[model samples]
Target: MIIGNCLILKDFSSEPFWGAVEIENGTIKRVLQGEVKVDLDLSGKLVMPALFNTHTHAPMTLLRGVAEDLSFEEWLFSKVLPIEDRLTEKMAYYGTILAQMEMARHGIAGFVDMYFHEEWIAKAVRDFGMRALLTRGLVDSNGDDGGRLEENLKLYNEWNGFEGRIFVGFGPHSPYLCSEEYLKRVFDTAKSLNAPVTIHLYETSKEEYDLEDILNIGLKEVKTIAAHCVHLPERYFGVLKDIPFFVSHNPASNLKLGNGIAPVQRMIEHGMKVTLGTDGAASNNSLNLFFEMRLASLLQKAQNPRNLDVNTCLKMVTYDGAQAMGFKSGKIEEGWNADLVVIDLDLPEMFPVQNIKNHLVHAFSGEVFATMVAGKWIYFDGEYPTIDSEEVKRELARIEKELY
Candidate 1:
């Protein structure tokens, strides 16, 4: 496939230019500078690498707005967990379908998900033709039945290399939820299979002291994605800089749960890799990374006002996220995966496009004209060719009415 005559951000740090992209066998073959025979002419659109969501619970779309305006503990223990207990495999499938539709509409080509019923989630992601890193949310409090660990191993074996789009990982929920012995076991299992791990760390101020123990488990030796370092102490900044730690900044979910802002500027200054995420729909109420990017930049600007530039925030959602997830599709360059998005440049909010980066960061809230994953057009011109959006919504409605 060839996409021609579009504004291209080949590299986020570089200037935008007009060019064409050639894709072959699900990879970007080359980027051409001048005119070429093409399958699509996006003359009035802007083409860039699609967004990556570093942390999320994809199936929680069914629980959006269900438990609101409550303390984190009440929201989790009393409201969320009770509903989660009633979730069936079929419900997880349809719920994940709904979440994928939402994400596709918002220009997210890939995401990292940690949740229950991951087999169902994997099926949904495969059917939708999206890229994902799937992990089973593991907690030792469920006791030594060994069911969770077995399921994690099964997922890794079955779905780790599916279609070259899906990867499997281990998610130990959080430090407090899993014991040291169990966490070590999980880490060893992950290392044996050479899979990545994503976990929540220091989300609240109360968990500040527990952060060191979790960090001391040789995280530097593994590929780690740590979600919500909102309350991490200043002393740990140097430690994080030396490790393979990818800090996923979930601004909306953190703020909604009343967790303080993460020191994003300080982390970047310390040479740490930071990325963006929407968390789950249950807490964030939306899986919109554009909104997340806006809030992420604004929250940091409120602290120092001069830090958190638009280009850096753009990189957080783009290259930084893909690099953290070990994906080769973030930049529109040769030999990269052709995961791309086309933004409409004709919207009311996009008028007078003086500076593309500034508009993308602050003023652009228009339609994502199209979304592609691995050289395939999963979403184009406001339509999902491979998805039944209305059917997924109807299924979600039925599930919510029956369960909630």
Candidate 2:
């Protein structure tokens, strides 16, 4: 399929241009200079690479506003987990689908998810026609006797690299929740399978893990995406620098939870790859990457005016996030994956198109004209083409009343 007559913003470094894109077998076959016979006419649209959310408890959208104004323990044990116990797989499927819809309309093509009952989340992704890196969260806190680890192994064995859209990985929950022995076992398993491991790390100062001994596991070969790092100390910068770990910065959730701001500039200075994440709807109250991008930049710029530039912010929200999750669809180059979003060029908020990257970082809302993943139009204009979105709304109402 060829999409023509659109303004193409290829990547962060390049200037926007008027061009066409030819896609074949889920990859961009050609990035042409001008219009020709095309399959899709995006005459008035602005096409750019879609964004990604690097960390999320996806189905926790079911718990949005359920634990407001509470301490971390009360939020989890009293308010959150009680409702989570009531979450049926059928209800959680629709809940995750609802979050997917919100993310899709906001121009997010993919996300990283960690939660229990994630097999259904994988089902939701398959049906939604987007992309996700799913990690079934595992922890040693419960006397389930490694059942959570077993669930993650089952998820990985069945869904890792499934359908070219889902990638399953190990999720050890967080450093504070799992024993060092358990973390080493999980990382060793991940290394053997050559799979990704997603986890929370240094999320709050109140929580502590023997990171000194844990970091010395020397499993530098295992790929890990650590969320938050809101309290990671500077002494371990050199320790993490030599490891295969990257940081997923969740600014909104940290602020909302009274967790201090992550030392993003310091980490970047230490050669860390920082990416953006929405955390979960319960904390962030939204799944929009544009809003997260604004918050991410504003918080960094609070330290120094030139801390995080708009271009770098855009890159972190879009391409860098995708690469961290092993996706090939973050750039609109020839021979790359055809994952993209189309912006409505006629909107008033986007008027006087002087600098698009600047407007996107500071002024853009979640509004989108279209979203395509892997050469297929999943979201167009205002409707989801490949999703039965109505089914979710009907089920969610019944589930909502029960949870609340």
- Residue-wise lDDT of candidate 2 within 100-122, one digit each (tens)? 88899989999999898899999
TM-score top scorer: 1
Prediction 1 global C-alpha lDDT: 0.86
Residue 56 in model 1: lDDT: 96
Model 2 poorest 10 in a row by lDDT: 210-219
What lDDT is reached at residue 249 by model 1? 94
Model 1 alpha-carbon miss at residue 248, Å: 0.6
RMSD (CA, Å), each prediction? 1.5, 1.6
TM-score of predicted structure 2: 0.96
